Structure 1
Amino acid sequence: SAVQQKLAALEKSSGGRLGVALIDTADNTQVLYRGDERFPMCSTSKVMAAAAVLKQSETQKQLLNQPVEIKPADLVNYNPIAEKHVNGTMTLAELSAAALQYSDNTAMNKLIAQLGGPGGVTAFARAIGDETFRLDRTEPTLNTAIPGDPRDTTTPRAMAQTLRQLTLGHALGETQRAQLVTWLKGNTTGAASIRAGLPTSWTVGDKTGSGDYGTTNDIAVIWPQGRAPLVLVTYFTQPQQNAESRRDVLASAARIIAEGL
């Protein structure tokens, strides 16, 4: 299709490897580019950790209000929110919001610990029917994004389907689902990524990710005004370990997708 030729051309112009999955919930149609190739998730994995804690809260009704101590030893490489609460506490709700909306890496590690390790995050994926997602490491080493390394990867197709289920479907309870949506819509790190390729009138909830090998990711739910929502996953990685981020590639991929709907 025209869209796949334009995505291929975008990829060729960028020098990297681009993965795209769009789900149009209007007719359940899918648009895939390298849809079944593995990409390093980097921080887009934080959505699965937050959703796993949300699932726990369906039975532990007060779980999200549970305070968790932030100790200096907990701090890793990027902790914009956790830094503000060292030697104090944050609730699991606050850590989930921090992980999602500011991509706080300490917050993510606390969520992983709450789930009993990376295997507990992966287990949630399996429980909701995602057999592709795998979380193997904690922050910050899960971002190494080494070519060919299957650790901490998923595919665009798998992530799109799972993000659809978590936000638009009923993998989570009603209150949990709405909270996840509210968190994604309040993301602060996404202005230059998918959002930048879309009409300003459209509502977007997204989670970015970045890592080594110039890995630059964004996963999004999109609510166009007067139109069924879309799920869009854009993964991008590059052959040089020290390559710079290319959020413009994600904006451009989203623009090409928007041309046609």
Structure 2
Amino acid sequence: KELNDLEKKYNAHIGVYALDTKSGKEVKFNSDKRFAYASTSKAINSAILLEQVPYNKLNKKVHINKDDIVAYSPILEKYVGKDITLKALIEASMTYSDNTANNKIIKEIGGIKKVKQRLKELGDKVTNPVRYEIELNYYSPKSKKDTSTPAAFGKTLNKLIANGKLSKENKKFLLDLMLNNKSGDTLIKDGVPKDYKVADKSGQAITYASRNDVAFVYPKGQSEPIVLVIFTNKDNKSDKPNDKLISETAKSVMKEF
């Protein structure tokens, strides 16, 4: 199905970047247009931390206090005045989209500044982390804060995870969380053939029906993943998104591989 047609149909804006890491083939569609990445950035903060902490050291503990807590922290809110391992922080951020877990992960890396530094080293000059959760969700089409483009984001994911510096164990670990997340079943996972394995992290900003999914898709009989970034938004601040957009975009895109 044409991507223009899905835009028309859903009255939405679609940004896609897909890369078959076996061949290098790319599918692009508004791949240089900026979009709020929302929670799909949990995948990137989680990988950046895993580049600096070996799997056997994930049992290291960090103290959580009252000041750490931000809205929507299903797991971390039970940890006030307690310590958690780095392993459980990543589990909480990835499976439950715990916002306190993500912020603490950022602090462990060293703060946004350091996250930004790492993106520049990978050659990503586009992804622009500015705020922590939850303010990073207050997207404004007139501001570059906390946005990236489908292209810049997907290249970064490729470089961090599909072909980066993680150990095999840290890679399995992060990918298992993405494979088992149920929050992304109506998204890319809903659109690909049943043959395909899907490791994703979804996201949703507060404004402009900003609705996203990023994934490592493994087609039947292929061990190298296809990296797939799908960002979408609408013209109005109070618009509600339709997950089917993403299911339908994934389905179309998969047709080229």
TM-score normalised by structure 1 residue count: 0.91
- 8 A contact 2:208–2:238 mirrored in 1: yes
Q: Distance in 2 between matches of 1:18 and 1:80?
A: 30
Is 1:27 paired with 2:23? yes
Matches within 5 A, 1:94-105: 94-105=88-99
Aligned-partner residue type, residue 163 of structure 1: L
| Cα deviation, residue 188, structure 1 | 2.6
Partner residue, 1:202 = 196
How many aligned positions are there? 255
Judge which range, 129-138 or 78-87, deviates more.
78-87
Partner residue, 1:120 = 114
Aligned-partner residue type, residue 52 of structure 1: I
Is 1:186 paired with 2:180? yes
**Candidates 187, 204, 215, aligned match of 2:210:** 215
Q: Distance in 2 between matches of 1:171 and 1:19?
A: 28
Gaps of 5+ in 2: none
Aligned-partner residue type, residue 210 of structure 2: T
| Cα deviation, residue 139, structure 1 | 0.4
Matches within 5 A, 1:241-252: 241-252=237-248
- 8 A contact 2:27–2:256 mirrored in 1: no
| Cα deviation, residue 70, structure 1 | 2.6
Q: Distance in 1 between matches of 2:232 and 2:96?
A: 20
| Cα deviation, residue 107, structure 1 | 0.5
Helix, strand or coil for the counterpart of 1:57? Answer: coil
Q: Considering only aligned residues, what root-mean-square deviation do their CA atoms show, in Å?
A: 1.8
- 8 A contact 2:158–2:164 mirrored in 1: no
Q: Distance in 1 between matches of 2:111 and 2:45?
A: 10
- 8 A contact 1:39–1:153 mirrored in 2: yes
Judge which range, 222-231 or 167-176, deviates more.
167-176
- 8 A contact 2:47–2:161 mirrored in 1: no
**Candidates 32, 53, 57, aligned match of 1:57:** 53
| Cα deviation, residue 218, structure 1 | 0.4
**Identity percentage over the alignment?**
33
Is 1:258 paired with 2:222? no
| Cα deviation, residue 87, structure 1 | 3.0
Q: Distance in 2 between matches of 1:186 and 1:84?
A: 23
Gaps of 5+ in 1: none
Aligned-partner residue type, residue 217 of structure 1: N
TM-score normalised by structure 2 residue count: 0.92
CA pair 245-74 structure 1, distance change in 2 beyond 3 A: farther
